[PDB]
Amino acid sequence: YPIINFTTAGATVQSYTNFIRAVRGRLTTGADVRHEIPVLPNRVGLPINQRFILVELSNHAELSVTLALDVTNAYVVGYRAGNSAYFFHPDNQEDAEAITHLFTDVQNRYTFAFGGNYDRLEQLAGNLRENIELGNGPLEEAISALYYYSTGGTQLPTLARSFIICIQMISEAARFQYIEGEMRTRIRYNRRSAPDPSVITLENSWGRLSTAIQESNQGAFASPIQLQRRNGSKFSVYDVSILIPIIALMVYRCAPPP
Numbered sequence: 001y002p003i004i005n006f007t008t009a010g011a012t013v014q015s016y017t018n019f020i021r022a023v024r025g026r027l028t029t030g031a032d033v034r035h036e037i038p039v040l041p042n043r044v045g046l047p048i049n050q051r052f053i054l055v056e057l058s059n060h061a062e063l064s065v066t067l068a069l070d071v072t073n074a075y076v077v078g079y080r081a082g083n084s085a086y087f088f089h090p091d092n093q094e095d096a097e098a099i100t101h102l103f104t105d106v107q108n109r110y111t112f113a114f115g116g117n118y119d120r121l122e123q124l125a126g127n128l129r130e131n132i133e134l135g136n137g138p139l140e141e142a143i144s145a146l147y148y149y150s151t152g153g154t155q156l157p158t159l160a161r162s163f164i165i166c167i168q169m170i171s172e173a174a175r176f177q178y179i180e181g182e183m184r185t186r187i188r189y190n191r192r193s194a195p196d197p198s199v200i201t202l203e204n205s206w207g208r209l210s211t212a213i214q215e216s217n218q219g220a221f222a223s224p225i226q227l228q229r230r231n232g233s234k235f236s237v238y239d240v241s242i243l244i245p246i247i248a249l250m251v252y253r254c255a256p257p258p
């Protein structure tokens with residue numbers, strides 16, 4: 001499977017930008033684009049040898065971990081650190097089999113009894129996304145936390161918190177140019193801060209926005225979708241047009257009409 005590297009050590013807006021662009025390049029194939037917005041591969045009929053991509057993260061502490069992302073949804077399904085690999089609890093039998101194809105060389109593979117969805121991760125971490133700071137420092141720290149989990153140095157809450165950080169700075173950033181933009185800002189001024197309502201609502205609405213766009217009438221939504229601006233005020237989305245500079249890729253929801 002393809003591998004994309006990134007390091008928090010000396011990270012700049014440009015190195016982060018190159019990273020995200022590279023990830024998107026490996027996620028999509030250019031075969032499916034609706035209203036100028038790329039669509040991820042359809043899970044149905046997708047060969048297993050084209051199912052995942054790897055993201056190898058390194059930090060100033062000279063530690064490295066490798067996350068595994070499902071190309072059909074950019075979902076982080078697990079990670080490897082040295083001689084151990086951990087996978088979130090699969091949603092179905094098909095996904096449980098698919099993951100057996102990842103890190104086939106690791107001496108110890110473990111599957112968590114819990115899922116990797118925010119609801120569960122926030123419960124384990126004992127904090128919501130709105131209260132978990134994001135930025136290069138948090139990522140640098142998160143990479144160390146994941147790395148030391150097998151040895152017992154990392155507590156469950158801290159592991160969950162760390163996943164929440166990696167997922168947003170990698171998966172959500174790849175999905176939304178807007179979120180990638182918020183992370184670039186944090187890196188540029190080396191300032192850490194929790195995600196505002198605009199970020200949170202976008203993360204929560206990806207599936208619905210993907211469906212609305214794909215089932216739209218020439219781009220026009222049948223029903224509007226409400227998002228939130230940074231100050232928390234409501235923002236109504238009625239068309240795919242206003243989302244072009246915001247959403248980088250969508251999950252496949254339906255076939256494109258003639």
Ligand SMILES: Nc1ncnc2[nH]cnc12
Nearest residue numbers: 074075076116117118171
């Ligand atoms: N594990 C995960 N990977 C990607 N996006 C997610 N959103 C919530 N959990 C996620």
